[PDB]
C-alpha cells in the first residue's frame, strides 16, 4: 500500500567538470533503478530494484509535482489525511524535492519559479483549486522540527527557537499526540504563503547556529490542514477536513538520531507483521504513527546520488525504500 518513489539527482558542477560517471541508471517506464556495484561501464556487476515510480536526473520539479503530489492533494482535498516523506542521504535532494530553491538573479516570482518544490507548489495550488470553485475554506500550516529528541516550532514569531515544546498523548483520539504550544498559522491568501516560508527560513537560520549540523540532523514536519465547506453547483454543502504532512527526514547516513532509528525499526515491525511496533520509541513515529500502518495515505520519496563515492549509501537507501513498499495502511 505505502507508495515509494525514487528520485535520482543530477551531477553538480564539481562532478561535471571532474568528468563524473553515473553508477546509477533509471527506467521510468519499467519503474526500475539499476546501480553498478562494481567494475567498468564496459563490463560490470549491477543491483536492480523496482519501485512505484522512478525519476532520473532529468526530472524537473513540475514533473514530480504533477506525477506524485497533485493526486495526493486531491485526496487531502477530499477530506483525507496524507503524508509524504523525503528519505535519503545528505546531499541527495530531500530539501530540494520538498521546498525546492530559487532561480538565480531574481529571475522569477515565487509562483513561477521552476525551482519551487512540493511545499510552495502545494500551498499555491490549494488557493488555486479552491478559490475558483465555490468553496469556503481556511488553510492552517505548522512547522514542527525534531533535533535530538526535542521539539521546535519554526513558525512562531513571538518565541525564539531554543524554546523546545512538550508533547503529550491525546486523551481523546488514541495513537495521536498533542504538542503543547505548537503554532498553527492561518494562510489568509496566496500572498501570505511566501512570508510564512520567509519567516520559517529565517528561524531555521538561528536553529542552525544553536544546533550542530542542524539541517542534516533534524526532521521537519510542515503541515497544512484544510477546512472546507464546499457548496456544489446544486446547493449541497460538504464539510471536509484534510491534512497533508510533508516530512523532510534527517540524513540517512551513518551521535545517534533516535527518531531515524525508531523509524527504520517501525518499518521492520510493519513489514514483518510483528505484533509490537515501536512507535512510542521516538518523537517522530509518535507524531506520525498514523502515517505508518495507520489510516493515513503515505508516500515515500527516496532521494539518491548518481556519483560513485556514494554507492554504499545509495545501495542502503534503495534497499531501505524497497522494504517499505510492504507496509499496509489506510
Ligand atoms: C532571503 N529569503 C528569500 C526567500 C527565501 N525563501 C522563503 C524561500 O525561497 N524558500 C523557503 C522554503 C521553505 C521554507 C521553510 F521554512 C519551510 C518550507 C519551505 F518550503 C522554500 C523556498 C526556498 O527553496 C522557496 C522556493 C520557491 C518558491 C517559494 C519558496 C528565504 F526566506 C531567504
Ligand atoms: N533533483 C535535483 N535537481 C537539481 N539539483 C538537485 C536535485 N536534488 C538535489 N539537488 C541539489 O543537491 C544539493 C544538496 O541538495 P539538498 O536538496 O540540500 O539535499 P539534502 O536536503 O538531502 O541534504 C543542492 O545543491 C541542490 O541544489
Ligand atoms: Mg536537507
From Swiss-Prot:
Compartments in which it is found: Cytoplasm; Cytoplasm, Cytoskeleton, Spindle pole
Post-translational modification: A subset of this protein primarily localized at the spindle pole is phosphorylated by NEK6 during mitosis; phosphorylation is required for mitotic function.
Residues annotated as binding ATP: 88-95
Sequence positions bearing N6-acetyllysine: 129
Domain spans labelled Kinesin motor: 1-327
Disease entry from the Swiss-Prot or TrEMBL record: Microcephaly with or without chorioretinopathy, lymphedema, or impaired intellectual development: An autosomal dominant disorder that involves an overlapping but variable spectrum of central nervous system and ocular developmental anomalies. Microcephaly ranges from mild to severe and is often associated with mild to moderate developmental delay and a characteristic facial phenotype with upslanting palpebral fissures, broad nose with rounded tip, long philtrum with thin upper lip, prominent chin, and prominent ears.
Protein task: Motor protein required for establishing a bipolar spindle and thus contributing to chromosome congression during mitosis. Required in non-mitotic cells for transport of secretory proteins from the Golgi complex to the cell surface.
Subunit structure: Interacts with the thyroid hormone receptor in the presence of thyroid hormone. Component of a large chromatin remodeling complex, at least composed of MYSM1, PCAF, RBM10 and KIF11/TRIP5. Interacts (via C-terminus) with the kinase NEK6 in both interphase and mitosis. Interacts with RARRES1 and AGBL2. Interacts with TPX2.
UniProt record similarity statement: Belongs to the TRAFAC class myosin-kinesin ATPase superfamily. Kinesin family. BimC subfamily.
Protein name, entry field: Kinesin-like protein KIF11
Organism placement in taxonomy: Eukaryota, Metazoa, Chordata, Craniata, Vertebrata
Amino acid at each position: 500500500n505505502i507508495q515509494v518513489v525514487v528520485r535520482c539527482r543530477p551531477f553538480n558542477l564539481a562532478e561535471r567538470k571532474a568528468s563524473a560517471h553515473s553508477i546509477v541508471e533509471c527506467d521510468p517506464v519499467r519503474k526500475e533503478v539499476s546501480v553498478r556495484t562494481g567494475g567498468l561501464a564496459d563490463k560490470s556487476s549491477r543491483k536492480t530494484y523496482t519501485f512505484d515510480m522512478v525519476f532520473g536526473a532529468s526530472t524537473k520539479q513540475i514533473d514530480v509535482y504533477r506525477s506524485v503530489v497533485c493526486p495526493i492533494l486531491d485526496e487531502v482535498i477530499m477530506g483525507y489525511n496524507c503524508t509524504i516523506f523525503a528519505y535519503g542521504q545528505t546531499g541527495t535532494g530531500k530539501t530540494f524535492t520538498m521546498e525546492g530553491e530559487r532561480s538565480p538573479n531574481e529571475e522569477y516570482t515565487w509562483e513561477e519559479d521552476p525551482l519551487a518544490g512540493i511545499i510552495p507548489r502545494t500551498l499555491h495550488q490549494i488557493f488555486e483549486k479552491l478559490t475558483d470553485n465555490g468553496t469556503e475554506f481556511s488553510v492552517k500550516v505548522s512547522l514542527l522540527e525534531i533535533y535530538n529528541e526535542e521539539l521546535f516550532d519554526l513558525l512562531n514569531p513571538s518565541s525564539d527557537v531554543s524554546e523546545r515544546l512538550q508533547m503529550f498523548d491525546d486523551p481523546r483520539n488514541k495513537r495521536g499526540v498533542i504538542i503543547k504550544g505548537l503554532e498553527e498559522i492561518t494562510v489568509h491568501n496566496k500572498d501570505e504563503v511566501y512570508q510564512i516560508l520567509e519567516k520559517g527560513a529565517a528561524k531555521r537560520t538561528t536553529a542552525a547556529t544553536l544546533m550542530n549540523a542542524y539541517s542534516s540532523r533534524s526532521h521537519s514536519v510542515f503541515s497544512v490542514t484544510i477546512h472546507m465547506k464546499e457548496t456544489t453547483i446544486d446547493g449541497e454543502e460538504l464539510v471536509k477536513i484534510g491534512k497533508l504532512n510533508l516530512v523532510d527526514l534527517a540524513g540517512s547516513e551513518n551521535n545517534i538520531n533516535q527518531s531515524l532509528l525508531t523509524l527504520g525499526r517501525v518499518i521492520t515491525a510493519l513489514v514483518e507483521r510483528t505484533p509490537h511496533v515501536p512507535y512510542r520509541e521516538s518523537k517522530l513515529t509518535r507524531i506520525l504513527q498514523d502515517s505508518l500502518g495507520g489510516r493515513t495515505r503515505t508516500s515515500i520519496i527516496a532521494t539518491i546520488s548518481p556519483a560513485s563515492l556514494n554507492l554504499e549509501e545509495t545501495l542502503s537507501t534503495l534497499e531501505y525504500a524497497h522494504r517499505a513498499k510492504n507496509i499496509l495502511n489506510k
